[PDB]
Amino acid sequence: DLYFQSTIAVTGSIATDHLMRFPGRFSEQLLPEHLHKVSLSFLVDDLVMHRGGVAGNMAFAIGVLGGEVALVGAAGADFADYRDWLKARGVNCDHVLISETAHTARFTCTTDVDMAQIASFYPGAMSEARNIKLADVVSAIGKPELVIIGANDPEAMFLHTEECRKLGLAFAADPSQQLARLSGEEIRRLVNGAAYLFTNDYEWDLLLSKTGWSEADVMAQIDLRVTTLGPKGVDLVEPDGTTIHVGVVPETSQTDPTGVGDAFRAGFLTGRSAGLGLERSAQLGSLVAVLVLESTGTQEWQWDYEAAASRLAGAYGEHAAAEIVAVLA
Amino acid sequence: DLYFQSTIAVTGSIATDHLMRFPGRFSEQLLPEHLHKVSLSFLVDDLVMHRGGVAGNMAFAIGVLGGEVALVGAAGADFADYRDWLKARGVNCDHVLISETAHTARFTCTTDVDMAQIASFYPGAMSEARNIKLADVVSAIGKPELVIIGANDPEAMFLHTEECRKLGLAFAADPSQQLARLSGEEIRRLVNGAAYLFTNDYEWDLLLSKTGWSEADVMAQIDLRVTTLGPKGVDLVEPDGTTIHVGVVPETSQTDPTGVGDAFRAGFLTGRSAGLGLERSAQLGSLVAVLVLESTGTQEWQWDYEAAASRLAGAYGEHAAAEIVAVLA
Ligand SMILES: Nc1ncnc2c1ncn2[C@@H]1O[C@@H](CO)[C@@H](O)[C@H]1O
Ligand SMILES: Nc1ncnc2c1ncn2[C@@H]1O[C@@H](CO)[C@@H](O)[C@H]1O
DSSP states (O other): OOSOBOOEEEESOOEEEEEEEOSSOHHHHOOTTGGGSOEEEEEOSOEEEEEEOHHHHHHHHHHHTTOOEEEEOEEOTTHHHHHHHHHTTTEEOTTOEEOSSOOOEEEEEEEOTTSOEEEEEEOGGGGGGGGOOHHHHHHHHOBOSEEEEESOOHHHHHHHHHHHHHHTOOEEEEOGGGTTTSOHHHHHTTTTTOSEEEEEHHHHHHHHHHHOOOHHHHHTTOSOEEEEOGGGOEEEEOSSSOEEEEOOOOOSOOOOOTTHHHHHHHHHHHHHHTTOOHHHHHHHHHHHHHHHHTSSSSSOOOOOHHHHHHHHHHHHOHHHHHHHHHSOO | OOSOBOOEEEESOOEEEEEEEOSSOHHHHOOTTGGGSOEEEEEOSOEEEEEEOHHHHHHHHHHHTTOOEEEEOEEOTTHHHHHHHHHTTTEEOTTOEEOSSOOOEEEEEEEOTTSOEEEEEEOGGGGGGGGOOHHHHHHHHOBOSEEEEESOOHHHHHHHHHHHHHHTOOEEEEOGGGTTTSOHHHHHTTTTTOSEEEEEHHHHHHHHHHHOOOHHHHHTTOSOEEEEOGGGOEEEEOSSSOEEEEOOOOOSOOOOOTTHHHHHHHHHHHHHHTTOOHHHHHHHHHHHHHHHHTSSSSSOOOOOHHHHHHHHHHHHOHHHHHHHHHSOO
């Protein structure tokens, strides 16, 4: 592709999140005989609304961190206010498709005492993301260094990936939130040639369960597997074997785990974009991740290059801290 | 209790239900390693709003069937319209507590291809049900023949049960939807002296799991256990052993399983109130149940004493049909 260069393009959902808390344990209610057919209803304690969508969340964090970033997804007419919120953190919202008729997607999530999460996602306007052409985005802003293919309209996820394939754009397969809806055929066609494959360990097992793939089958198709491991940090795997592991940044609170994955990805890719190695990028990712864990909502954390250095030092040593803080603003 | 007699009083929730469909299988996404901590998000196909709440649903069906019924629960100021809907089917709504400040409860439910259900319930005004005194209801309308203690504000469930205990009113323990939220101590104190204990088989196992009780411990405290069994119908158990079983009324469609339990209970109790035996009452219950299964929403079915006779005959024989249709309007 001989077109001019220029950014991270974040594709994926744009939504309003309704986050609720169940003051009990989901596992305790999940009987393994009855898992053939669940019958679950959780009386919640709390209900609160925040800006969301995987693409919204990732684009926001890249912007906070000072990265150049374009948000590419479909929203309802209601988007104008959310746009202003994103633009305030430097997010390019020019290529957001605004539906003439449909409402911005709605996420309804319940979190339990162990940070387990059970949620529904109503697409609304998201379904129109299949009508967005990345070719038009590239035309206007140049080739991005990376396109993130986040959870989105299932058809859009594939069309965007195919467009990256034919445009010769590097892409990160980040199907996370959609693995439950996507068939094994649908997951398989998103993976080949990915610079990065992002998931957590559950989703990793779900992917391999539904694809019929072994880990070896996947590593042959991708440049890097990134698998977050909850409290055990993150694994960075290479073509066949080499594995870098970074442990979490210890949390002061487990408030709300929504968007923790999105935040890690944004920090990590920002790190990678700034010439940081895999280990250092994952350490920065882990910090943004914990900042999200300690706040309610996905985009309600702050940046403060002083507190960042301090925390990174405390978890990873002062070499890590100094290396990360430097390659930034 | 030497106060004058008169009705079924239905206590439990009053809500707005948001019902969604996941065009996949929950079980297929539920990995049994990862059940320690789930991470589930379902892209849904459909979102629709209907009148709901266990008490709303049960009171509605008793009313449709021509029964005398009083609805006792807490709702928001928004209740006026829902009231008119209930009154149109003969439901006494005089003893509904209307919150000055809080919103009518919200149920958000996702149903999969196998009729499994995963849901959140936001109490809002329901929490004020703990301020309702059944003594005041009894004062105004006389002693009901039965009080149903449906899923409600957890504290209200117990206060209502205690009030039935001291007022000497027969009550049906129907904790179904709240078993997930209630502790084992909280479930245990709802059961003693119940004329009926209603659940499905999952909830039955959940109850015994969380109470630390054996089936024998429960049967010693209640007059009858009624355990619905999905496609395998319903078990009616007696103090120690005698078990009547009634199989389902074969469905023409599996549209929406929400409120199927509530409908069975309403039909069964209506049957019991009309001097029908346990078997005949469960057969009538099973019909209301299938009528709910075949419609979207909980209160969107109809009555048509001609089609009722026909269906009952087809499933249970024409003796059953004639016996049930007779003791009604
Ligand atoms: N199935 C889904 N499809 C697209 N986005 C989703 C889905 N489930 C959750 N999300 C978004 O992902 C979360 C953060 O990772 C929320 O902000 C929510 O809006
Ligand atoms: N946890 C709960 N507490 C009270 N009512 C509930 C709960 N979960 C579901 N419901 C109500 O029960 C359903 C029917 O049984 C819905 O109409 C819903 O409003």
